[PDB]
Design a protein around this ligand. Structure first.
Ligand SMILES: CCCCCCCCCCCCCCCCCC(=O)O[C@@H](COC(=O)CCCCCCCCCCCCCCC)COP(=O)(O)OC[C@H](O)CO
Ligand SMILES: CCCCCCCCCCCCCCCC(=O)OC[C@H](COP(=O)(O)OCCN)OC(=O)CCCCCCCCCCCCCCC
Lengths: 431, 93
């Protein structure tokens, strides 16, 4: 169904859905990990863990309502799921937790307990999770000296530096009325439209969020977390992408979808696709493909992530993918364009209409904060049927033709060509 | 082709160097660098340092061999300038 929005400082947006029967309500803030100086990165995740530390007992014992949160770059949200008849008590808990009282939550001993838990979690992430660590390092090395490269969970020193002063400063400078939007995804229709606009339901700090000076940039770079003890090799690539609210977002998404994903050990994924899959199937080269188009408010990131075990032929693995990108930017067949259209329609329908209201609420908040109104499935399909081979060619001429790239790798990367033999394979052939 | 014999190095991926872990490198995409701005100053400072680290190794041997050649030549003028008539005898006998 269509969404309804209104705004008096606070914005109330609801996506009614009789199909589901788990009403949810939350608050999405427009400031995440992209609006914080590198002095102490780990503040947003610290707040998230604080919200996920002791109020869980309160919500479980008092009534029936489960709460969750997620912060990636600027979609800092605190969603509180519930039953259809318990939205009143859900908003009651939210009100009692985010305006008053706001002092007993920040107890000292609770703060050190949360700090220790977050330190353990970030250490575990650094030690174990390689596929996400390489992407985080790609983010760090793609936006050097800019509040868009610092990691979303911070560094060890950043967590251990500050205690309570900068946390409360962040709360006072980023938990405001200007960039706060409530969400009513679930099985509710109009009570959310009124309960948020109420005398008891107000947000503190009716001021303005501080504005940064240097917005964003992009410069090619390398990072080599070479840990040869690790068995496999994880590498990633990236090219300057496209931010949200641009009339090319779907074109970049389709360009990413054209090549698609691939898993070597899944027989179904081995028996489809495009020419590069056959080229890498002839001689075994890699195991995973993940063509991504990451989009944020300030800038974007369109690239490629993979993991391989045949450490000897990293150069061949990179060379084939770059040659296929060049083939895309020179000549595209219409059958692959049609199959990419169908696959993108399927994947976007799956993502935007999943059965879990939490993801739908997160997407609705991300759209409402920077758009003002959510774009429905039908309009997305209408705008994607107009994608043509000439449009894709023209778009790829500007973005994928002699543009800066950034590579992040770890594991056994001895055979990885440093920067010139990996960049000179774009416009140096018999064009 | 066929495997070789004993070697102290290999090819890319299996060169054979010591195992190491914990080193991070970087790069700044030399397109977006504007590489040289103080090339004359850099050359001046590098030449100054290189000359500073190698004072004697060039000045001393050349000086001593110039002195040796000078000694030989001056002995020659003591002999081979309208003077051999009274010293070639004692040289050769
Ligand atoms: C009787 C002669 C007939 C034609 C001879 C053809 C071969 C010409 C070269 C002769 C030897 C030169 C010595 C160096 C050759 C290797 C050059 C090289 O490696 O450079 C590039 C390769 O250069 C080439 O040779 C590519 C062109 C292939 C040409 C095939 C034969 C064409 C024959 C037509 C005539 C060519 C000669 C014209 C002379 C004016 C590397 O880039 P890449 O694309 O291989 O790297 C990709 C990497 O993995 C990352 O992506
Ligand atoms: C050391 C001692 C010997 C010195 C020479 C050894 C290296 C051989 C040349 C390597 C250069 C190279 O390989 O150039 C490789 C480049 C392209 O390949 P690419 O990788 O740049 O792009 C491919 C990946 N994107 O083609 C050339 O330039 C061919 C030369 C063109 C200019 C000459 C044309 C012939 C006219 C007659 C000229 C007669 C002189």
């Amino acid at each position: 169904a269509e969404v309804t929005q209104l705004s008096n400082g606070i914005v109330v947006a609801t996506e009614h859905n009789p199909s589901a029967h788990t009403a949810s309500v939350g608050v999405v803030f427009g400031s995440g990990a992209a609006n914080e100086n590198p002095y102490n990165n780990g503040v947003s995740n610290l707040w998230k863990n604080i919200f996920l530390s002791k109020e869980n007992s309160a919500v479980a014992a008092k009534e029936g309502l489960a709460l969750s949160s997620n912060i990636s770059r600027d979609f800092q949200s605190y969603i509180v799921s519930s039953l259809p008849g318990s939205t009143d008590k859900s908003l009651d808990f939210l009100n009692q937790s985010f305006i008053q009282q706001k002092a007993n939550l920040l107890s000292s001993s609770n703060f050190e307990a949360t700090k220790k838990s977050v330190l353990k979690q970030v250490q575990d992430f650094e030690e174990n999770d390689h596929p996400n660590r390489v992407l985080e390092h790609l983010h760090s090395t793609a936006f050097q000296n800019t509040p868009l490269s610092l990691p979303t969970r911070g560094t060890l020193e950043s967590l251990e530096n500050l205690v309570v002063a900068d946390l409360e400063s962040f709360a006072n400078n980023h938990f405001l009325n200007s960039n706060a939007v409530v969400v009513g995804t679930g099985n509710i229709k109009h009570e959310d439209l009124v309960n948020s606009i109420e005398s008891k339901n107000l947000s503190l700090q009716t001021g303005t969020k501080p504005v940064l000076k240097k917005k964003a940039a992009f410069l090619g770079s390398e990072v080599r977390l070479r840990d040869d003890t690790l068995p496999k090799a994880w590498i990633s690539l990236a090219v300057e992408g496209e931010p949200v609210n641009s009339p090319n977002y779907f074109v970049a998404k389709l360009a990413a979808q054209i090549f698609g994903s691939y898993n070597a050990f899944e027989p179904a994924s081995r028996l489809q696709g495009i020419k590069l899959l056959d080229n890498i199937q002839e001689y075994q080269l890699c195991d995973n493909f993940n063509h991504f188009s990451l989009s944020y408010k300030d800038s974007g990131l369109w690239g490629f992530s993979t993991a391989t075990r045949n450490v000897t032929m990293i150069d061949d693995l990179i060379h084939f993918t770059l040659k296929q990108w060049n083939r895309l930017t020179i000549s595209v067949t219409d059958t692959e364009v049609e199959r990419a259209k169908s696959l993108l329609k399927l994947q976007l329908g799956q993502l935007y209409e999943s059965g879990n209201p939490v993801n739908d609420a997160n997407l609705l908040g991300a759209e409402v904060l920077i758009k003002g109104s959510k774009l429905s499935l039908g309009e997305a399909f209408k705008k994607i049927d107009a994608i043509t081979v000439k449009d894709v060619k023209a778009w790829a001429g500007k973005r994928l033709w002699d543009q800066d790239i950034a590579i992040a790798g770890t594991g056994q990367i001895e055979g990885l060509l440093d920067y010139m033999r990996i960049r000179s394979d774009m416009s140096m052939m018999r064009w | 082709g066929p495997p070789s014999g004993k070697t102290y190095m290999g090819w890319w991926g299996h060169m054979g160097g010591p195992k190491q872990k914990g080193i991070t490198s970087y790069a700044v995409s030399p397109y977006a660098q504007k590489p040289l701005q103080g090339i004359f100053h850099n050359a001046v400072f590098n030449s100054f340092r290189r000359f500073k680290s190698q004072f004697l190794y060039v000045l001393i041997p050349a000086g001593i061999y110039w002195y040796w050649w000078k000694n030989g030549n001056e002995y020659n003028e003591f002999l081979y300038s309208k003077a051999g008539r009274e010293e070639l005898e004692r040289v050769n006998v």
